[PDB]
Write an enzyme that holds these catalytic residues in place. Sequence first.
Site, short mmCIF file in Angstrom:
data_model
loop_
_atom_site.label_atom_id
_atom_site.label_comp_id
_atom_site.label_asym_id
_atom_site.label_seq_id
_atom_site.Cartn_x
_atom_site.Cartn_y
_atom_site.Cartn_z
CB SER A 95 -11.78 -36.17 16.60
OG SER A 95 -10.86 -36.64 17.56
N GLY A 96 -13.52 -35.83 19.55
CA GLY A 96 -13.64 -35.08 20.78
C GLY A 96 -15.09 -34.83 21.17
CB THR A 100 -16.15 -40.74 26.44
OG1 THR A 100 -16.32 -39.33 26.63
CG2 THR A 100 -14.83 -41.00 25.73
CG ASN A 146 -10.34 -34.76 20.35
OD1 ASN A 146 -10.44 -34.17 21.43
ND2 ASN A 146 -10.69 -36.04 20.20
CB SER A 149 -7.97 -37.65 19.14
OG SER A 149 -8.34 -38.31 17.93
CB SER A 150 -9.71 -43.08 20.66
OG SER A 150 -10.72 -42.88 19.69
N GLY A 381 -12.84 -39.49 14.53
CA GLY A 381 -13.79 -38.68 13.78
C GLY A 381 -13.18 -37.97 12.58
CD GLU A 383 -7.78 -36.35 11.49
OE1 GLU A 383 -7.57 -35.81 12.59
OE2 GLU A 383 -7.16 -37.35 11.08
#
Length: 689
Positions: A95-96, A100, A146, A149-150, A381, A383
């Site tokens: 994550s992060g 993108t 993150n 984080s989406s 992602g 974690e």
Amino acid sequence: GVPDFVLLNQITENAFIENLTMRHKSDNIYTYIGDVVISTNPFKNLNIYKESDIKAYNGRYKYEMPPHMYALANDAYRSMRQSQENQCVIISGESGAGKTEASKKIMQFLTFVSSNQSPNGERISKMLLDSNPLLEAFGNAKTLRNDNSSRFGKYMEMQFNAVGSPIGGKITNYLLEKSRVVGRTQGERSFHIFYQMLKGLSQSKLDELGLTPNAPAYEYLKKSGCFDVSTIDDSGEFKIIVKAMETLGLKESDQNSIWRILAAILHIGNITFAEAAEQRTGTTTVKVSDTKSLAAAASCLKTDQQSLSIALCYRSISTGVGKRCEVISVPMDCNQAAYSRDALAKALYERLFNWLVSKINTIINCTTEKGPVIGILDIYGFEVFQNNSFEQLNINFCNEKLQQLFIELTLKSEQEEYVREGIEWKNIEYFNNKPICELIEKKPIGLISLLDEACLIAKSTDQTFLDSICKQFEKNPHLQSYVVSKDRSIGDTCFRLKHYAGDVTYDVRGFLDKNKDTLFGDLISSMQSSSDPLVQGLFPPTRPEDSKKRPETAGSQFRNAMNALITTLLACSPHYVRCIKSNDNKQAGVIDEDRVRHQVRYLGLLENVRVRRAGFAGRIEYTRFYNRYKMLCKKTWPSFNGTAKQATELILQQHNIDKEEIRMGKTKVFIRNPTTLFYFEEKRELEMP
């Protein structure tokens, strides 16, 4: 000299890292694992994605220039250009790590190749750059690991025309986490749209709605545990977001219309049940002493306060095709009341987010053009927190499904393409297809198959279900506990669960009520028959492109949402990009050895390389093996046939060499040990000084 990463002086573990480090410290970010790209995230703007570099990799191949345009793309993304089809890229990682950046690399590479100029085509290149300050507002939240984080699965789709230039695109979300609306650890948040409101509207408007700029004062928000975040400044961000709100096309007039929807949710949040003491002992009814708060909701919902209390607190059932006769009922316990209450506040937001984001595109989405589609993937992602729970189970479960995706595509689908493209291929040993971890939770007699059984049994609490796992299983691979596995590390109130590599211990808190989220007619029907355009808006005209059967919990519906996702992923031309986080200090030019090494290990990416080709020491491509060792053998000159792998046979069969000593396939020649690469050179060295 040093053609990409495949060609190493020593194909070993230590050498693999020593070179990897030598790559990173030589401005070589992208590294090839086997016609597949592995990248990282700078977490900021880097001057390596701008015209100059784009013009460098045009009309050339991989072995000609440094890592950037892996030949496969040029040989696959273009292979379907004559065939005449569309593509789809899948991306994964921590994550992060740039759900993108890796996506942006596709765009900046995708443009220009499409012949540059296009008023409607270059327009998106400008707006999508202005999407960075925008996208971070809607579908993003802060996790302790993150910041950006989406919190929802996303499958972007780029549209094009009958030429190759872009035109527009749409968005598709999924079921998304459930208990993040009411439950969470102290420090995290639920969703921006709520916090951005409280510190946006004037205290005057808030007082009219019986509100206050302070979450603790509420109840629903108080059940979360926390409110203020040390890293985020919501008060100062609002006025900045307003500019972004207007950037799309959400004027104050529209803003106010949106705040009402949230205000409705807040009014529901000020509604609990003062455990009615009507019953004297066991069971109990439901009565609302705080009528002020209860009335406030019905007032803004624009519905009969009385009917609302009678219809909800007392469920109706009698639908005999002719279609129902309601009102017959009797009170029930508090737990079920609070349960049914949440289900309402959970189903309202789900259908809100869907209808909200879809109506935003109404202003953004291009209507001027029309054509095919190319897809892009982006999801949350991996974690690990101080204490794991049901939430981590479902998230980690998705990773197992994600790992299967690659295997199904970059390992399985590609193999079937060899035997389809008229190539003499043989089934080479490949590590277990691990379909057992999938069948153990899909078809009858399975994890979530037994869980579904334990759910509807309203009395079978979380603890009882946990017991059904230890007994039914603890025999099938990938599962342990404190009973079978003699290990004190496993608490009596916890259990062990083996993943594809690492071990994780979970808690059984929630599970059922958190996952179920079931809301039948009686309660919904009262809202669907509303006259207000807003309320009924949250209940679209019955199943939008998602019908099938309707009643069967929302937990089981999650599985269906993710299954419908993979089904459409295994029916296109995939493209693989994986990301890795730099470090936990946000440093530039610093690689955490242990952190990165671990990621590559527990994912089994080096074993993937082995299996991908076949598995052994030193390996080289046929297409490349040919145009390299020609002078060694005779009749291997411009008067050749064309094939590379066929020539290799002619060379090794004439000198009488056991054919099992060399494993033959489509790509990647196989000769055990790297000492033979010298044997080839020597065979060429001392025969022609």
